DNA sequence: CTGGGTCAAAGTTCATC
DNA sequence: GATGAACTTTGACCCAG
């Protein structure tokens, strides 16, 4: 079930991982960032639009759209 | 499931915006799509497509691309560099 | 009431023309 | 600039009380 949005993007989310209302595209997203401590940079104005067909435009931008909606890389498990 | 690419006839290389296709005519389909690109047939709009006569009619590999039922709703947006 | 995983099919890169 | 073989990331779908 897919009943909520995503707080970063916009798209349908089943609800909240690593703590905030979010798609299967931005949980991926981020734990994949924090699993591989990945570091991006933005070409622009470090305030890219972040929607469902911009979002993987500047991951620097998604990313810190993340963490300023909640998500905490804490939540985030290691590896199995 | 077919390891030939429908639009040229090159091995495929798997399913790329619908249609078992080549790196070739994938990579094609998104430059022309994402660039807006339009061209024009020098002969009469049936040229033969295939691995090796490919690249000598734009107009008539993309007409095929989307015979074949390759999507321009499958191409992204372009990702920074 | 959300942790984990996969891998098809999106993406980009850059040597070669 | 255009091409295309090789290389990287994404996210829909599945697991689990
Ligand atoms: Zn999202
Ligand atoms: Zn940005
Ligand atoms: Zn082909
Ligand atoms: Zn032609």
Redesign the pocket.
Known sequence: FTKHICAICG?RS??????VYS????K??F??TVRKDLTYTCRDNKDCLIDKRQ??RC?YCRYQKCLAMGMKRE???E??
């Open positions: 798209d089943s609800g909240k991982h690593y703590g798609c299967e595209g931005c991926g997203f734990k994949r979002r993987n991951q939540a985030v498990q590896e199995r």
